[PDB]
Amino acid sequence: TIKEMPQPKTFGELKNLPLLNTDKPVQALMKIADELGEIFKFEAPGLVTRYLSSQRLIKEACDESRFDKNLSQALKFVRDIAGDGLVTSWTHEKNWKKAHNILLPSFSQQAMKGYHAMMVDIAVQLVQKWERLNADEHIEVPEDMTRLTLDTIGLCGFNYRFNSFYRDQPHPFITSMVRALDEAMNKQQRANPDDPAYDENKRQFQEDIKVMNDLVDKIIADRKASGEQSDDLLTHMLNGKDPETGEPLDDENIRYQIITFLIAGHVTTSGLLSFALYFLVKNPHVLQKAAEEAARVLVDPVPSYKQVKQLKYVGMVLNEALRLWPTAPAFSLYAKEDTVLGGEYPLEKGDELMVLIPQLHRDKTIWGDDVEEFRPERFENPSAIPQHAFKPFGNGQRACIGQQFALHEATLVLGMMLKHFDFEDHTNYELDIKETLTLKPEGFVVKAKSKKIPLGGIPS
Numbered sequence: 193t194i195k196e197m198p199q200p201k202t203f204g205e206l207k208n209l210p211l212l213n214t215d216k217p218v219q220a221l222m223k224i225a226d227e228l229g230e231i232f233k234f235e236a237p238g239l240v241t242r243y244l245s246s247q248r249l250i251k252e253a254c255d256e257s258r259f260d261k262n263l264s265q266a267l268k269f270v271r272d273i274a275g276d277g278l279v280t281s282w283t284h285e286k287n288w289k290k291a292h293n294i295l296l297p298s299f300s301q302q303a304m305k306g307y308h309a310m311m312v313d314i315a316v317q318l319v320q321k322w323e324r325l326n327a328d329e330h331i332e333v334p335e336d337m338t339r340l341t342l343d344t345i346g347l348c349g350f351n352y353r354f355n356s357f358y359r360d361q362p363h364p365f366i367t368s369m370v371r372a373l374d375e376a377m378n379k380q381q382r383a384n385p386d387d388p389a390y391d392e393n394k395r396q397f398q399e400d401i402k403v404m405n406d407l408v409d410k411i412i413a414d415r416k417a418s419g420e421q422s423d424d425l426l427t428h429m430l431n432g433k434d435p436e437t438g439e440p441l442d443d444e445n446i447r448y449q450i451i452t453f454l455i456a457g458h459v460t461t462s463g464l465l466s467f468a469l470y471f472l473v474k475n476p477h478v479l480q481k482a483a484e485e486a487a488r489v490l491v492d493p494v495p496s497y498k499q500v501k502q503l504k505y506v507g508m509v510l511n512e513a514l515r516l517w518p519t520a521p522a523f524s525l526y527a528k529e530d531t532v533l534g535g536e537y538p539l540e541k542g543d544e545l546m547v548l549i550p551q552l553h554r555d556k557t558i559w560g561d562d563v564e565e566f567r568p569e570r571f572e573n574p575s576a577i578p579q580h581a582f583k584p585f586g587n588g589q590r591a592c593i594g595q596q597f598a599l600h601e602a603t604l605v606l607g608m609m610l611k612h613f614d615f616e617d618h619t620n621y622e623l624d625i626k627e628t629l630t631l632k633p634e635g636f637v638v639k640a641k642s643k644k645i646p647l648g649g650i651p652s
């Protein structure tokens with residue numbers, strides 16, 4: 193059967209574009225998806241795309257045989273920041289597979305074990321910051337989580353210490369990065385993007401990128417110092433070669449991968465930890481159960497690699513946080529050839545799709561009517577999940593390469609947090625999600641009372 197696709201309000205020649213005149217576009221698309229269902233067509237000037245919400249359709253979309261990764265109009269703009277790095281590359285581009293085969297070992301199981309000691313190093317610093325707060329002080333959660341995840345990838349991946357916890361205002365890299373990423377997101381709303389009204393937006397974007405590359409200059413210059421016994425993500429960028437081609441990365445592409453992993457390797461993990469702690473203080477019984485698991489397993493002054501993989505409820509808690517609000521909320525696709533989607537929606541070649549991940553994770557077909565509630569107990573048995581129903585890390589060979597890096601870090605930090613502190617919703621925070629392509633709760637503050645359990649490190 194062939195069915196016609198529902199389409200939201202059209203505003204003449206701008207088509208659907210004025211519908212996204214909000215600083216919360218993903219959440220607006222969720223509102224739309226509620227009123228139109230599993231799929232709807234979205235039209236902008238020059239561009240058309242189809243948003244998906246149902247596990248049924250989306251599981252067909254993840255067929256690598258039928259569909260390859262498309263670059264969103266978002267990603268085409270982020271490409272101005274990250275070039276042809278792993279995230280913003282075409283699959284058919286010759287720098288993807290190259291950098292993929294070169295860098296994939298950096299996220300192997302034996303690689304991950306090397307990162308732990310450094311993950312703890314920055315984790316210790318976060319814990320000790322909260323341990324040293326005075327009585328009348330609030331914890332700006334997403335701000336401290338950003339400090340944590342930036343230093344982690346900065347140290348694990350490049351042996352470079354941002355020293356975020358030694359700073360008042362965010363590191364100049366964070367400031368420029370957000371503005372740069374805010375531009376790409378806000379740029380999607382501009383009929384005539386080259387109208388000189390935006391020449392100011394183009395000038396600040398230039399500055400932001402100048403700052404970020406100045407930091408990359410620091411990282412490269414500091415490695416050639418040296419910089420010797422290191423076998424981290426940066427080492428493989430410089431010395432490693434692609435098997436198929438026998439070629440290393442260029443002068444240019446290397447810089448792009450650094451920018452890529454500095455952004456991608458922290459921004460969504462900052463959001464995950466922020467969302468996770470938010471739900472825990474909004475569901476204290478879940479908080480209790482989780483904090484009880486933390487007290488049970490974390491028996492040494494600092495967690496071991498073995499212990500972090502024993503915290504499965506903490507891992508469950510994070511998955512459930514990734515379910516309700518996937519910090520990387522969407523990824524695009526295109527049909528490799530002509531086909532029909534869901535056996536009822538004909539697709540031409542070159543047609544773009546959008547996997548609306550938050551709406552996907554809300555498919556009542558898979559999780560029940562119990563959707564909007566926060567229950568980590570959904571993930572007690574992973575094999576009970578009709579997969580392609582839970583994809584917070586994308587799909588296929590273009591799925592998140594740092595998925596295990598993220599979850600291990602997050603579980604570790606969240607674990608140490610529960611072991612060492614109790615938490616009170618000090619301001620009774622109503623959830624306010626800020627969009628910057630990625631998702632993150634904004635203005636969310638807490639109070640932390642110390643359980644008087646000391647530390648003692650640090651290995652590496």
Ligand code: HEM
Pocket residue numbers: 261278279292345452453456457458460461464518519520522523524583584585586587589590591592593594595597598
């Ligand atoms: C909660 C944390 C994270 C989430 C939710 C997340 C989400 C995602 C998603 C949805 C994609 C697919 C993008 C697309 O298909 O268009 C992706 C790809 C990617 N992620 Fe992440 N990510 C996280 C953490 C990380 C970390 C920690 C790293 C690196 C240390 C990382 C690096 C990358 C890279 C390099 C790609 C593209 C690789 C390729 O396609 O070849 N991400 N991620």
Ligand SMILES: CCCCCCCCCCCCCCCC(=O)O
Pocket residue numbers: 212217218264266270274279280377380451452453455456519520521522523629630
């Ligand atoms: C270095 C790479 C950074 C890119 C990371 C951001 C990608 C996460 C998913 C965002 C997709 C777009 C969602 C909001 C925009 C929209 O579709 O209206």
Ligand code: NI
Pocket residue numbers: 328330618
């Ligand atoms: Ni107060």
Ligand code: NI
Pocket residue numbers: 402405406409
């Ligand atoms: Ni410079």
Ligand code: NI
Pocket residue numbers: 297423428
């Ligand atoms: Ni190696």
Ligand code: NI
Pocket residue numbers: 530540541
């Ligand atoms: Ni055709």
